[PDB]
Ligand binder design. Structure first.
Ligand SMILES: Nc1ncnc2c1ncn2[C@@H]1O[C@H](CSCC[C@H](N)C(=O)O)[C@@H](O)[C@H]1O
Lengths: 263, 5
């Protein structure tokens, strides 16, 4: 349902680098815990009051980072490892999750790394990243540091960025050329916006030329964008971008296209 | 809702 793709609407090139995913016991336990956390109506009412008051002078992500609500799920250990085509007892040095959020997908990627770095723009979620003992970098610090990261993950940040192609070239700058990969994730159909206070959008200053009407057409359009920076798709998968539930729904899902990119 | 959006 959420993991299927019509590989005939893909070009012959992309049909070969596809990686199929399915529901995992990790996906299962995430959905279970999100449902039972979506059952407590009184706590959601508390959250709703605080949200309404604070939205008048905060961002929705900042609010959900203040309340510990709305954790998300991209892949599971199994899916992540089989997508990166790595072993369970496989370890490298450096990781950089740009726009890490609350760090729960950074948590799922952490065990295979000795140094886990992160960048975030909501200080409330920055505190949660720091409470997970992550080295918080800046929006202009991860690029000009002196290191060359082994794995860079920009999971679900191009929709929410002001200069995504600039970011892609910046990733190309500080990535290890020989065995360094980029884990990227996009919500297709491409919905790009820059957040503001109270859940308001704002258009980006650099818009990506991902022109299509369904998931398959836009993923066919992505190669050119990745080619401008310096990356080529080596593997990619379809996953659900899941989020915990509120008082109206028990779970939320979005259509994600996850790519692994080569320099 | 969804924290992404
Ligand atoms: N310019 C920027 N640089 C770094 N992070 C940014 C940013 N603009 C927005 N963000 C952050 O990116 C987050 C996107 S939510 C995507 C996070 C995903 N679950 C993951 O772990 O990979 C938001 O919380 C937002 O605060």
């Amino acid at each position: 349902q959420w993991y299927v793709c019509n590989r005939e609407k893909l070009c012959e090139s992309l049909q070969a680098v596809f990686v199929q995913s399915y529901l995992d016991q990790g996906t299962q336990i995430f959905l279970n815990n999100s449902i039972e956390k979506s059952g407590w109506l009184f706590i959601q009412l508390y959250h709703s009051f605080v949200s309404s008051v604070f939205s008048l002078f905060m961002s929705r992500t900042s609010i959900n980072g203040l309340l510990g609500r709305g954790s998300m799920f991209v892949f599971s250990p199994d899916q992540f490892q089989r997508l990166l085509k790595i072993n369970p007892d496989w370890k490298t040095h450096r990781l950089l999750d740009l726009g890490a959020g609350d760090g729960e997908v950074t948590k799922i990627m952490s065990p295979h790394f000795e140094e886990i770095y992160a960048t975030e723009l909501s200080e409330t979620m920055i505190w949660q990243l720091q409470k997970k003992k992550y080295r918080v970098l800046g929006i202009n610090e991860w690029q000009n540091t002196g290191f060359q990261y082994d794995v860079i993950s920009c999971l679900n940040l191009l929709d929410r960025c002001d200069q995504p192609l600039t970011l892609l070239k910046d990733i190309r700058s500080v990535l290890e050329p020989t065995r360094g990969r980029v884990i990227l994730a996009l919500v297709l159909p491409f919905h790009p916006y820059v957040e503001n206070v109270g859940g308001k959008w704002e258009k980006p200053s650099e818009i990506l030329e991902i022109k299509g009407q369904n998931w398959e057409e836009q993923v066919n359009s992505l190669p050119e964008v990745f080619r401008k920076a310096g990356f080529v798709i080596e593997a990619f998968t379809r996953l659900p971008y899941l989020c915990e539930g509120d008082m109206y729904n028990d779970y939320y899902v979005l259509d994600d296209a996850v790519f692994v990119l080569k320099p | 809702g969804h924290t992404h959006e």
